[PDB]
Design a protein around this ligand. Structure first.
Ligand code: CLA
Ligand code: CLA
Ligand code: CLA
Ligand code: CLA
Ligand code: CLA
Ligand code: CLA
Ligand code: CLA
Ligand SMILES: CCCCCCCCCCCCCCCC(=O)OC[C@H](CO[C@@H]1O[C@H](CS(=O)(=O)O)[C@@H](O)[C@H](O)[C@H]1O)OC(=O)CCCCCCCCCCCCCCC
Ligand SMILES: CC(/C=C/C=C(C)/C=C/[C@@]12O[C@]1(C)C[C@@H](O)CC2(C)C)=C\C=C\C=C(C)\C=C\C=C(C)\C=C\[C@@]12O[C@]1(C)C[C@@H](O)CC2(C)C
Ligand SMILES: CC1=C(/C=C/C(C)=C/C=C/C(C)=C/C=C/C=C(C)/C=C/C=C(C)/C=C/C2=C(C)CCCC2(C)C)C(C)(C)CCC1
Ligand SMILES: CC1=C(C/C=C(\C)CCC[C@H](C)CCC[C@H](C)CCCC(C)C)C(=O)c2ccccc2C1=O
Ligand code: SF4
Lengths: 41, 226, 217, 83, 740
């Protein structure tokens, strides 16, 4: 497990996790707020 | 005698196995094949003997269960509507399903899955660890699962309750007879499958057709040729 | 409580981190989870809270379905929330955030008791010192154990084993509830009386789901 | 496929000639390989009661070759109007 | 002699080596200290010849890597079948294949990309696919989405089995070196079971499943009204009234009366007029004959039963008088060197992909395949580029074998030694013929451009001024048009419609029509020959001069992949065989770009189009006979006359193509400074950036370094090839979808 945990601790795995998290956050924001351009409320 | 023995194949095998007719053209009983430690590959003499005897027992059960309903339906023993062909019982719904059963075929399939998964997984755990199933409490009948040195022949108060084979000579005779009838059953089940595919009828019907018309009803005429 | 104990499969080799000390330790871990002691105690706490909520929810579902079969005007366990908020004085939105508000305190206390054992029973919460102190990892005791049958070690151990076994059975019950409600669209007690009415025919193979029918022949 | 049919007769004659060939020279058996001819060689596979080298792989290979030669000759004659 | 040799559990299945990234090599085993280490970790990852010197472990790694690639391919195929099962209009396409476009990709509406879900027809919205999977499934008898779902599930199961097989045959039961070295057994089993048995199984599927479903589909009945394939399999009545020879029931096969099977095993050449594809019975008899031929070929090599040929004996026996030791040491080379086998496999596989592209643009072996111009163009271009990449990698891995696995002790007077012994003459003659071909083709093009711009249309090398007609190609076309007349009397028609004859059209669109070859065709064919000749020159110069040269006599000690030998001897940059492959990659790109441009223009001008009562109206009006003789014609009448759909695709479903088009141009530009520049400039810029990060104490512990010269060349060629291929892909697909 700790060998597997250090494998997930490697740079490409945490990079993939960050990319998935950021892409999902931005996609859900754009879906639930369709076409945001002007900062108004 | 030796049934089609091939030379340069008895170099790696002596006479210990029941049949051991020396027939090994391709070569799979060589200890050089899959040599090392651990589980390894599935081509090893221990697993080969175990799978051969298990295939033999299953094919013997299948040959008996494919012969008995048709023969007993030709007589007055079992009723005729329960004497359907072995492929029409529900094993292949394109071939036929016996609708007059006490349960749905998938319900029987699930009951079979639970029961035979229990049986075969206990068998596998005893194959990997000999005598291990006699230690963990099952129902109080753990002593029935003592096993033996050979995984193929566990024995005990249930598998050998008749206690046949007290000495070595008749035990070797029984093992040789079991493997001979089992190999005959492999051939029998092979023929049953081929006859079912290319005739669409029961094996006893094919036997009666060959007996009544030897030249007019055989493999050549069943393929359309003359 | 170890060594020659019944495992999840006879003849299996138990893991090194599963020595049988924990309740329900059958040596079942193909994926080698709970190897680290901190992850082991996290897994024990997670299993305990999932078990407790599983038996609570399954008991509520069974009680409501039994009363509905007997004649009480109770809806099915599925889509009960719709009629619940229809008859609730409290609307949705406020209800879930209210539940989160009175849940965050207990969850924070549980998490910081799991990370720091005995730190909750320091008089910080309304001057409570003897109470709110975890006797074990996922077994707080104190105010949560008013009657003291857990003082005996043997009684505590057998109660832990019974609790974890009934909790795992409750996970299986909840999974079965979801599966055969998606398959039959009926109450679990309705499925039970259908199975005890015609056991040889009414089963998982006759609902039109689970086992698919394509040729019908 | 008919018994006594000319196609079956010619292909059976070809298969029998191929089988009787390697029994005495001509065709490359296990014990006769060489580059252009027949040269002495080992056995490896037991002949199972067969004199010289005429084991099961020999009869299998030569029966396959005989069946192939027979069907080729039969279809070539059928293409040009013969049997 | 031949037997299974397997070691039990040589490698433990643990995750301890997943934590340490660099573990296969001792250089990366010490951990990282600079950023190039990371690139090295992603460079020598699958260079198993450098990790260990033991051939057995290398062979085991190769076996497991092949199992992993097969699992990846099966996962991809299962995903294709799943996309056809759920996010597709295959059932709607089966009703009217000539009016609904094939679509199997549906996007999520997120940021306005839902406009990519175009109106393909049949009440569906999605991306118009050009892979031709719809035609393949129609050829396979697939009717409902349930069959596609089952195929996807089976493909996922087989991919899991392949991954388990890789894990098992590496970690649990690893085959020994003697198991891999049984080349005779490998060849026999591959020719008999991998190819012969597969061809027989596919022929049986075609005969028992694909032929009746395709016949009923061509009859015009509803796909739902068509009986399921198992109904054809079991009950013989439907296959009997669909094909009377099935009423005999396997009698004509064993009684040698194979002519009775002539109804469903046919030899009608050409295309089926109902669907514009190859006849399914012809494909069934084809795969049956292929299976029989490969079954015959699989019993050639002696393995364990005396009879059969020996590869070493065959190689050693073929020795001529002008070649010394004829094929002597090649058996030991190909049984010990993985890279020589890789070179041979890649060369033959790339050539096979080229034959595949040519022979399925020529004969469309799928129902309603020729009507979809976009599918045919995409398939041709894709197989073309895969073949070109594979034949480049052939020279690459041949050079790798020459650097690493070549032994002069086993090669004294053999064929390889004599090729090395006259490599200078080989390269000089190849250079001369490359120069001559480039002159007498491209100078002809420049001559045409000049005399067109000089107002001399009578001085051109065109179809009207100076006829350099392809007399050999025209004669071969006329001979193959008359192949069924005299030399193949049992063929009902010609083997293809490209030689001549009538015009086959489906749905008002031209499926296949005769192709005329003129002066422009001769010019582009000789241009292609010149480009292939130059690429061969580059790759052969890389292979033969990989070990030594008069310029550098110890190039073998420098390895296969080194940047240079310094600025000595005037400069020795890009002297390695790897750099030769890197240079030849661009030449392969240019060659295949010109080839696919010729293909697209030729089918758009002289093959594809619509059929009216007056005649055949092509897409571009047949300008190839008058505009393809000049570079300005390719600029204007092919690159500017087309590509208007790509730039005007905005606001439609094709717009992403145009977007990709622009992005492709970007990538094609972004490669150039990796191709230009060097390393010292970027290293000094990185030093300045290191100073900037050190001022703020944010300098990384891993020292950032510029990319290596070999690494920079690889990045440049990869981005250049990606940009060019994506540019051609976007332009081709947008042009062929908007007007096709
Ligand atoms: C009748 C055809 C035939 C013949 C003569 C052979 C002969 C051989 N095979 Mg092959 N094999 C066959 C069919 C055949 N095989 C099929 C159908 C498969 C697919 C399941 C394989 C898969 C296979 C593998 C994966 C390997 C062999 C190997 C071998 C060699 C020794 C092991 C052996 O006897 O096979 C035992 C294996 C079988 C599958 C028995 C087939 C018996 C047929 C069906 C009768 C020998 C040269 C081994 C080898 O070359 O080692 C270097 C090896 O690794 N074979
Ligand atoms: C590229 C294909 C390929 C090849 C060449 C091999 C070759 C081999 N495997 Mg592997 N195997 C493969 C694919 C392959 N396998 C796949 C896809 C799986 C997963 C399903 C396995 C699962 C597997 C197991 C589980 C075992 C082998 C074993 C073997 C050896 C026995 C060869 C033999 O007698 O014939 C094959 C023999 C047969 C009887 C064929 C049976 C095929 C039916 C259809 C099942 C040999 C080294 C055995 C080994 O290492 O022992 C030496 C062993 O224990 N293989
Ligand atoms: C004003 C700043 C501030 C903030 C942001 C918090 C925030 C928190 N406190 Mg704290 N607390 C504070 C001041 C603060 N406290 C002060 C001044 C005292 C008195 C000394 C406490 C005494 C206190 C106790 C006794 C407990 C918390 C707990 C908590 C948590 C409960 C949050 C929750 O579920 O929502 C609110 C509903 C949260 C992390 C609980 C916790 O998780 O700790 C274990 C808990 O049991 N707090
Ligand atoms: C007739 C028997 C037979 C068959 C069918 C195959 C088939 C294959 N071999 Mg194998 N091979 C054989 C015998 C056979 N082999 C023998 C006897 C040897 C030892 C001399 C080898 C040694 C060998 C090597 C060294 C390599 C192969 C590889 C391959 C694959 C080539 C890739 C391809 O065409 O994709 C076709 C793909 C498919 C059709 C997908 C389905 C593949 C299934 C799962 C395989 C079924 C065939 C298998 C042999 C059955 C026995 C396995 C059994 C024990 C479970 C292919 C799966 C390459 C490889 O590793 O690929 C993974 C490779 O590098 N072969
Ligand atoms: C791999 C390819 C392939 C396959 C699978 C088939 C299969 C079939 N074809 Mg086809 N055929 C093929 C190629 C193929 N053919 C080719 C190349 C041609 C030449 C053009 C033909 C020409 C042809 C004609 C003209 C006809 C067929 C017919 C048939 C069927 C008859 C089966 C039969 O007699 O075979 C022999 C099959 C067996 C002997 C069965 C195999 C033995 C079994 C599996 C043993 C099982 C034993 C087992 C272990 C025990 C039971 C297990 C259980 C307990 C679980 C069958 C569906 C006929 C049809 O549709 O009528 C029904 C028909 O009229 N075919
Ligand atoms: C389209 C761009 C382009 C062009 C035209 C050339 C041209 C050339 N390169 Mg190059 N190449 C290029 C880009 C290009 N390169 C790039 C980017 C790379 C990097 C991968 C390479 C990689 C490369 C390699 C690796 C090789 C070449 C070779 C060649 C020669 C081709 C052989 C031939 O017949 O040339 C004939 C000459 C031309 C086609 C140039 C145009 C000639 C016109 C028609 C003018 C005709 C004569 C004119 C009338 C006289 C002018 C008179 C005036 C002085 C007054 C030639 C010198 C090969 C070589 O050295 O020779 C075989 C070789 O091995 N090149
Ligand atoms: C540009 C080259 C070219 C191509 C691609 C074709 C292609 C074709 N021609 Mg044509 N032909 C050509 C040149 C070509 N021809 C020149 C002549 C004048 C002599 C002819 C005369 C001609 C006639 C008279 C006929 C054809 C026919 C055909 C068709 C089938 C031919 C066949 O069975 O081949 C064999 C097919 C194969 C797949 C074999 C490939 C074997 C591979 C490549 C390995 C070969 C290795 C080799 C054996 C080793 C070398 C041995 C050497 C050292 C001795 C096909 C469309 C026939 C037709 O009308 O079509 C139906 C026909 O009747 N051709
Ligand atoms: C889903 C069901 C399985 C959940 C995960 C359980 C686990 O950890 O298994 C891992 C087990 C560990 O127990 C293994 O069990 C073995 C005995 S037996 O397999 O139980 O017979 C024994 O070697 C030892 O206890 C241990 O290695 O490893 C195995 O090899 C057991 C089989 C696992 C794969 C099953 C494939 C078929 C599934 C059904 C397909 C239809
Ligand atoms: C099944 C389950 C967990 C299963 C876990 C498994 C198999 C793990 C297996 C393994 O880890 C092992 C052992 C070892 C590893 O090496 C390998 C894996 C494979 C990883 C949890 C269920 C857990 C189930 C829970 C917690 C159920 C809670 C139910 C509640 C709260 C009900 C609330 C209700 O709201 C409803 C739903 C509807 C309303 O009508 C009524 C009310 C009452 C309102
Ligand atoms: C004298 C003697 C005897 C006898 C013997 C005999 C008589 C034998 C025979 C034998 C034989 C007689 C054999 C055979 C075999 C065969 C085979 C083995 C076959 C095969 C086949 C095949 C493989 C086929 C194929 C094909 C197909 C199907 C398709 C295509 C074409 C072809 C044809 C190729 C005895 C014993 C009594 C005693 C002693 C002495
Ligand atoms: C530009 C250039 C460099 C400098 C470039 C270097 C060192 C490589 C830089 C790679 C970067 C770090 C890749 C990752 C870029 C982004 C940070 C990743 C994407 C981020 C978004 C997803 C947010 C060379 O080192 C070089 C060497 C030899 C020949 C030509 C050149 C060359 O042209
Ligand atoms: S350092 Fe660069 S410029 Fe200098 S010889 Fe090497 S590759 Fe050429």
């Amino acid at each position: 497990m700790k060998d597997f945990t250090t494998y997930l601790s490697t740079a490409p795995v945490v990079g993939l996790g960050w990319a998935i998290f950021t892409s999902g956050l931005l996609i859900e924001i754009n879906r639930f707020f369709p076409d945001p351009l002007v900062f108004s409320f | 005698l030796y049934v089609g023995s091939d030379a340069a194949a008895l170099k790696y095998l002596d006479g210990t196995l029941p049949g051991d007719y020396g027939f090994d053209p391709l070569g799979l009983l060589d200890p050089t094949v899959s040599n090392g430690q651990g589980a390894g590959g599935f081509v090893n003499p221990r697993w080969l003997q175990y799978s051969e005897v298990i295939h033999a027992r299953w094919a013997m059960l299948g040959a008996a269960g494919c012969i008995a309903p048709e023969i007993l339906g030709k007589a007055g023993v079992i009723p005729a509507e329960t004497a359907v062909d072995w492929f029409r019982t529900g094993v292949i719904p394109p071939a036929g399903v016996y609708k007059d059963f006490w349960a749905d075929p998938f319900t029987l399939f699930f009951i079979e899955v639970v029961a035979i998964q229990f049986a075969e997984l206990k068998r596998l755990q005893d194959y990997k660890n000999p005598g291990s199933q006699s230690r963990q409490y099952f129902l109080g009948l753990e002593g029935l699962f003592k096993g033996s040195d050979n995984p193929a022949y566990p024995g005990g108060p249930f598998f050998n309750f008749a206690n046949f084979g007290k000495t070595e000579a008749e035990m070797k005779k029984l093992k040789l007879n079991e493997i001979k009838n089992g190999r005959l059953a492999m051939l029998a089940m092979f023929g049953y499958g081929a006859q079912a595919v290319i005739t669409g009828d029961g094996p006893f019907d094919n036997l009666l057709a060959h007996l009544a018309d030897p030249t007019g009803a055989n493999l050549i005429t069943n393929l359309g040729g003359k | 409580a170890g060594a020659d104990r019944p495992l999840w499969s006879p003849g299996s080799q138990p893991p090194a981190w599963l020595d049988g000390s924990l309740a329900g330790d059958y040596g079942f871990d193909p994926l080698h989870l709970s190897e680290e002691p901190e992850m082991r105690k996290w897994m024990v706490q997670a299993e305990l809270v999932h078990a407790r909520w599983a038996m609570l929810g399954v008991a509520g579902i069974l009680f409501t379905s039994i009363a509905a079969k007997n004649g009480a005007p109770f809806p099915d366990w599925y889509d009960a929330g719709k009629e619940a908020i229809k008859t609730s004085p409290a609307p949705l939105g406020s209800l879930i955030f209210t539940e989160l508000l009175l849940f965050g305190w207990v969850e924070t206390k549980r998490l910081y008791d799991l990370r720091n054992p005995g730190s909750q029973g320091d008089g910080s919460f309304l001057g409570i010192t003897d109470g709110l102190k975890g006797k074990e990892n996922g077994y707080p005791g104190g105010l949560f154990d008013p009657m003291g049958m857990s003082k005996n070690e043997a009684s505590f151990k057998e109660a832990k084993v019974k609790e974890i076994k009934n909790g795992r059975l409750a996970m299986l019950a909840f999974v079965g509830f979801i599966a055969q409600h998606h398959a039959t669209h009926k109450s679990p007690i309705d499925n039970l009386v259908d199975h005890v009415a015609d056991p040889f025919h009414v089963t998982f193979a006759t609902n039109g789901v689970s086992v698919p029918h394509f040729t019908e022949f | 496929g008919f018994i006594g049919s000319p196609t079956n007769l010619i292909m059976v004659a070809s298969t029998g000639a191929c089988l009787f060939a390697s029994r005495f020279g001509l065709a490359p058996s296990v014990r006769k390989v060489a580059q252009p001819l027949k040269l002495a060689d080992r056995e490896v596979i037991q002949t199972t009661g067969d004199p010289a080298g005429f084991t099961a792989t020999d009869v299998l290979a030569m029966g396959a070759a005989g069946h192939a030669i027979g069907v080729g000759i039969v279809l070539g004659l059928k293409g040009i109007g013969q049997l | 002699k031949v037997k299974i040799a397997v070691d039990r559990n040589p490698v433990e299945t643990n995750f301890e080596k997943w934590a340490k990234p660099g573990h296969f090599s001792r250089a990366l085993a010490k951990g990282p200290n600079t950023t190039t280490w990371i690139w090295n970790l992603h460079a020598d990852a699958h260079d198993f010849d450098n990790h260990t010197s033991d051939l057995e472990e290398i062979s085991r790694k190769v076996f497991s890597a092949h199992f992993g690639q097969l699992g990846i391919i099966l996962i991809w195929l299962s995903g294709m079948y799943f996309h056809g099962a759920r996010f597709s209009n295959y059932e709607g396409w089966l009703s009217d294949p000539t009016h609904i476009k094939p679509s199997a990709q549906v996007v999520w509406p997120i940021v306005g990309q839902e406009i990519l879900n175009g109106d393909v027809g049949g009440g569906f919205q999605g991306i118009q696919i050009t892979s031709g999977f719809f035609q393949l499934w129609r050829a396979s008898g697939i009717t409902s989405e349930l069959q596609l779902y089952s195929t996807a599930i089976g493909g996922l199961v087989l991919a899991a089995a392949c991954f388990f097989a890789g894990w098992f045959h590496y970690h649990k039961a690893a085959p020994k070196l003697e198991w891999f070295q049984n080349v005779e057994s490998m060849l026999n089993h591959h020719l008999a079971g991998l190819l012969g048995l597969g061809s027989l199984a596919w022929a049986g599927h075609q005969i028992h499943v694909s032929l009746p479903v395709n016949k009923l589909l061509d009859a015009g009945v509803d796909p739902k009204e068509i009986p399921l394939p198992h109904e054809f399999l079991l009950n013989q009545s439907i296959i009997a009234d669909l094909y009377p020879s099935f009423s005999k029931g396997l009698a004509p096969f064993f009684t040698l009366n194979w002519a009775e099977y002539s109804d469903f095993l046919t030899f009608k050449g050409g295309l089926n007029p109902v669907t514009g594809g190859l006849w399914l019975s012809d494909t069934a008899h084809h795969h049956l004959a292929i299976a029989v031929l490969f079954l015959v070929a699989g019993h050639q090599y002696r393995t364990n039963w005396g009879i059969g040929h020996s590869i070493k004996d065959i190689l050693e026996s073929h020795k001529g008088p002008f070649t010394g030791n004829g094929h002597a040491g090649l058996y030991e080379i190909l049984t010990t060197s993985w890279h020589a086998q890789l070179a041979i496999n890649l060369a033959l596989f790339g050539s096979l992909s080229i034959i595949v592209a040519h022979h399925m643009y020529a004969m469309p072996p799928y129902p309603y395949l020729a009507t979809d111009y976009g599918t045919q163009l995409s398939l041709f271009t894709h197989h073309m580029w895969i073949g070109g990449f594979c034949v480049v990698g052939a020279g690459a891995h041949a050079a790798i074998f020459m650097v690493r696995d070549y032994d002069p002790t086993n090669n004294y007077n053999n064929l390889l030694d004599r090729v090395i012994r006259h490599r200078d003459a080989i390269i000089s003659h190849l250079n001369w013929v490359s120069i001559f071909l480039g002159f007498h083709s491209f100078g002809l093009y420049i001559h045409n451009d000049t005399m067109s711009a000089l107002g001399r249309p009578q001085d051109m090398f065109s179809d009207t001024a100076i006829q350099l007609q392809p007399v050999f190609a025209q004669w071969i076309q006329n001979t193959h048009f008359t192949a069924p007349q005299l030399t193949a009397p049992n063929a009902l028609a010609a083997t293809s419609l490209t030689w001549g004859g009538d015009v086959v059209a489906v749905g008002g669109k031209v499926a296949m029509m005769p192709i005329a070859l003129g002066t422009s065709d001769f010019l582009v064919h000789h241009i292609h020959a010149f480009t292939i000749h130059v690429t061969v020159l580059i790759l052969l110069k890389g292979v033969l001069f990989a070990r030594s040269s008069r310029l550098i006599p110890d190039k073998a000690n420098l390895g296969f992949r080194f940047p240079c030998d310094g600025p000595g001897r005037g400069g020795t940059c890009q002297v390695s065989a790897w750099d030769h492959v890197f240079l030849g990659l661009f030449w392969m790109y240019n060659s295949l770009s010109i080839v696919i441009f010729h293909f697209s223009w030729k089918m758009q001008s002289d093959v594809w189009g619509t059929v009216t009562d007056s005649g055949v109206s092509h897409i571009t009006g047949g300008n190839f006979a008058q505009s393809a003789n000049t570079i300005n014609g390719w600029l204007r009448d092919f690159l500017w006359a087309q590509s208007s759909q790509v730039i005007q695709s905005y606001g439609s479903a094709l717009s992403a193509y145009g977007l990709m088009f622009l992005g492709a141009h970007f990538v094609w530009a972004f490669s150039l400074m990796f191709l230009f520049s060097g390393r010292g400039y970027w290293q000094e810029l990185i030093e300045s950036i290191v100073w900037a990060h050190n001022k703020l104490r944010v300098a990384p512990s891993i020292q950032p370094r510029a990319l290596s010269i070999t690494q920079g060349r690889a990045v440049g060629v990869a981005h250049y090839l990606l940009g060019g291929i994506a540019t051609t892909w976007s332009f081709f697909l947008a042009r062929i979808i908007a007007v096709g």
